[PDB]
């Protein structure tokens, strides 16, 4: 693989979770998702989470071993670079639905990302113009006008099945 990581940028709720899970479910021999590490007491280590002590996670973060990290209910969660490496070592493409900040560490030969921006729909006959859609479109626009330098491809998510097909075709070509 020339490109080993499919990075999906986009506003929260634009559909990246459905897209990511569908791609892996469809092609589990092609894609994988790096599960997070957490300091939340456990489950099975390595199933949905890797369990780590607070001190160990902090030491690893300080040593720049994490791609992303955050806190929730007195606990910490993060995606470790090593987890992505494991996927690559198996000849699989890692799918990462992350914030643009993650690209600082991901944009190297080691991870070789293909960065796709999944944009909010412009055709919305089935969606109420409520707070959720307005915020989705606002956030999508902020991302689009701020981080466009880093996009390899943009797909407007008007038809989610088409978005998935386009990603499959792009990956077949570029990765």
From Swiss-Prot:
Signal peptide: none annotated. Ubiquitous. Expression is significantly greater in brain relative to kidney, lung, and liver and in fetal brain and kidney relative to lung and liver. It is found in: Nucleus; Cytoplasm; Cell membrane. Residues 3-172 form the Guanylate kinase-like domain. It comes from the Eukaryota. The first L27 domain binds DLG1 and the second L27 domain probably binds LIN7. In the N-terminal section; belongs to the protein kinase superfamily. CAMK Ser/Thr protein kinase family. CaMK subfamily. It is linked to Intellectual developmental disorder with microcephaly and pontine and cerebellar hypoplasia: A disorder characterized by significantly below average general intellectual functioning associated with impairments in adaptive behavior and manifested during the developmental period. Affected individuals can manifest a severe phenotype consisting of severe intellectual deficit, congenital or postnatal microcephaly, disproportionate brainstem and cerebellar hypoplasia. A milder phenotype consists of intellectual disability alone or associated with nystagmus. Multidomain scaffolding Mg(2+)-independent protein kinase that catalyzes the phosphotransfer from ATP to proteins such as NRXN1, and plays a role in synaptic transmembrane protein anchoring and ion channel trafficking. Contributes to neural development and regulation of gene expression via interaction with the transcription factor TBR1. Binds to cell-surface proteins, including amyloid precursor protein, neurexins and syndecans. May mediate a link between the extracellular matrix and the actin cytoskeleton via its interaction with syndecan and with the actin/spectrin-binding protein 4.1. CASK and LIN7 form two mutually exclusive tripartite complexes with APBA1 or CASKIN1. Component of the brain-specific heterotrimeric complex (LIN-10-LIN-2-LIN-7 complex) composed of at least APBA1, CASK, and LIN7, which associates with the motor protein KIF17 to transport vesicles along microtubules. Forms a heterotrimeric complex with DLG1 and LIN7B via their L27 domains. Identified in a complex with ACTN4, IQGAP1, MAGI2, NPHS1, SPTAN1 and SPTBN1. Part of a complex containing CASK, TBR1 and TSPYL2. Interacts with WHRN. This is Peripheral plasma membrane protein CASK. The gene is CASK. The chain holds residues 739 to 914 of 926 of the full protein.
